[PDB]
Design a protein around this ligand. Sequence first.
Ligand SMILES: Nc1ccn([C@H]2CC[C@@H](COP(=O)(O)OP(=O)(O)OP(=O)(O)O)O2)c(=O)n1
Ligand SMILES: OC[C@H]1O[C@@](CO)(O[C@H]2O[C@H](CO)[C@@H](O)[C@H](O)[C@H]2O)[C@@H](O)[C@@H]1O
Ligand SMILES: OC[C@H]1O[C@@](CO)(O[C@H]2O[C@H](CO)[C@@H](O)[C@H](O)[C@H]2O)[C@@H](O)[C@@H]1O
Ligand SMILES: [Mn+2]
Length: 580
Amino acid sequence: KKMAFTLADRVTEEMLADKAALVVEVVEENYHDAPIVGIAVVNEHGRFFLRPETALADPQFVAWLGDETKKKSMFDSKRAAVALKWKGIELCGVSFDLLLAAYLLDPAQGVDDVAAAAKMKQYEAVRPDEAVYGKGAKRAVPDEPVLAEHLVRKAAAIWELERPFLDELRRNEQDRLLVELEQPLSSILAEMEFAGVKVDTKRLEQMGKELAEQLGTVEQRIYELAGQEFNINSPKQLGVILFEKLQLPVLKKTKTGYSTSADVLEKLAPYHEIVENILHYRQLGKLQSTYIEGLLKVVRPATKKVHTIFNQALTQTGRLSSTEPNLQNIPIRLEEGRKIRQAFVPSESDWLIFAADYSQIELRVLAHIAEDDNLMEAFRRDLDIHTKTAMDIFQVSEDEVTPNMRRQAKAVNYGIVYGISDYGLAQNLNISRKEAAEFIERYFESFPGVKRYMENIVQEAKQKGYVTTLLHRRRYLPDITSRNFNVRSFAERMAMNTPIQGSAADIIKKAMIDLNARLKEERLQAHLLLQVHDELILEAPKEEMERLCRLVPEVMEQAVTLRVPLKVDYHYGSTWYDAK
DNA sequence: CCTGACTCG
DNA sequence: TGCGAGTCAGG
Ligand SMILES: Nc1ccn([C@H]2CC[C@@H](COP(=O)(O)OP(=O)(O)OP(=O)(O)O)O2)c(=O)n1
Ligand SMILES: OC[C@H]1O[C@@](CO)(O[C@H]2O[C@H](CO)[C@@H](O)[C@H](O)[C@H]2O)[C@@H](O)[C@@H]1O
Ligand SMILES: OC[C@H]1O[C@@](CO)(O[C@H]2O[C@H](CO)[C@@H](O)[C@H](O)[C@H]2O)[C@@H](O)[C@@H]1O
Ligand SMILES: [Mn+2]
């Protein structure tokens, strides 16, 4: 605990070195158009601190940040780049991101600051962000001397830990995953974040108005059937109405009381018609509060755009998450909700929304990884397994399978491949638990390869302590040999799923890098807007639609090569809704 | 702040 | 007693 640094007045030559650690401190958790409160640099020549109004105005510093031959090591470089694009400054030459490096080494650590990453290497010369800035309503940037030291210490740490982290990544054969997949992707996400998505507020406000009219309607109806007023959005009061006043049977409890989950409500339908009305009310209430009122609170009024943050170092399987707003969970399943998408539009004049989508991506990953004959064959002829399961459950034929019921048989295929027990399956389809068992038992005799993959990956996880995905992403399962049935089972199901979801996650990540490449090389104006786990979303001038119909799917299928082919569905239209 | 509800993959 | 997420209302 003793460090020398220079609290600089101006940018000097010795700070513009070819290799350095860089800290562009942004305290606000949502970094979009957020204050940059301090800058630090560590290189061969020394340790420096700079005030932002100094460094960001000095054209030489800006030129050094923008030069990709001047290599930077950073912690969460997406935060920096974005907070810099809002200051009209471009960041280039990031060769090491400690955050991503740490997330690949172990997603469970849930690293959020340099101190926690340093924790993994015994490096103790840096304080965590909360012990410096404060918590919640106390969150305060301290006095400069304190601020400076801390930032310099963060650089110093990034500076000392680069090699160790890279050294460990090389042993696990995860170095190329960092440098060639994750890190390049970080910059792409920073663009999509900054470009934003344009929203039709006029339309959005009109719908919430209509939604309110329907909410009051359904609501009155609910009080009439119940013969009283209560708070529908209060599960405790609703529970009293349904199970105490109305006497409806209790199908399930939780640790705090009676259950009123959608699943329980659908099963209570024969007994009383208020349950269906509650379901419908809850549906509309969510649309209003989250997808109208939530969404309008985060639009930037001047440009009518929303800017989400794609949290890259958070999920345990390798997926991304989307926050403030979440644009990866916009309604589509029920026609009423699906309408919200009409308000998502192109940002320019004659531009359109292109939406490409992988077909059964996790079922193909399972096929490739488990090497199952009957499964690999079905895909080679181009059978639709969801449609092959739609019939099998809905007694129907291929000729009449509505999109609605290809989604309900979709969750059965996936459910089965991810350790759903017969209790789960029967409780999802309202069928006999004996019949549920039969389905599964048949499935594993029909696909013996998939069954043995399940047995094997659990065995391997017990022996190794972890599982891995195609591009060597890793998840550790320390609870895998727990004596407790519940604890053991949960980790076992993670040993089944992770390699699959994680692999689909790797693939679509790679597909984005190649797409971005194939875009800038062909000099097109088209650019990525969103990723929703297994689908990409772009906007482009009307003219470019021809190339994209050929380009986008070609890139997504050619990303990786598997023991089965990869298929992509695509559509375009003037609204994200019409892109169906 | 947590629990349970809804939303997506 | 299928997996991975986020946000919101009530208590
Ligand atoms: N009920 C569901 C739906 C989705 N998923 C996970 C596993 C698959 C991954 C992608 O699913 P979708 O994009 O919904 O469908 P797909 O099978 O990948 O492709 P398609 O749209 O052609 O059915 O998300 C899941 O576990 N359970
Ligand atoms: O930018 C995402 C990146 O930031 C970190 C901390 O450096 O997470 C913080 O910001 C997130 C996005 O706003 C919040 O969800 C989270 O609460 C906060 O810790 C990284 O963990 C994350 O990858
Ligand atoms: O360095 C990580 C990198 O290794 C890759 C690419 O070479 O996988 C290769 O090495 C693996 C074992 O050494 C094999 O599974 C594979 O056959 C081989 O291509 C990437 O998957 C990984 O990111
Ligand atoms: Mn898909």
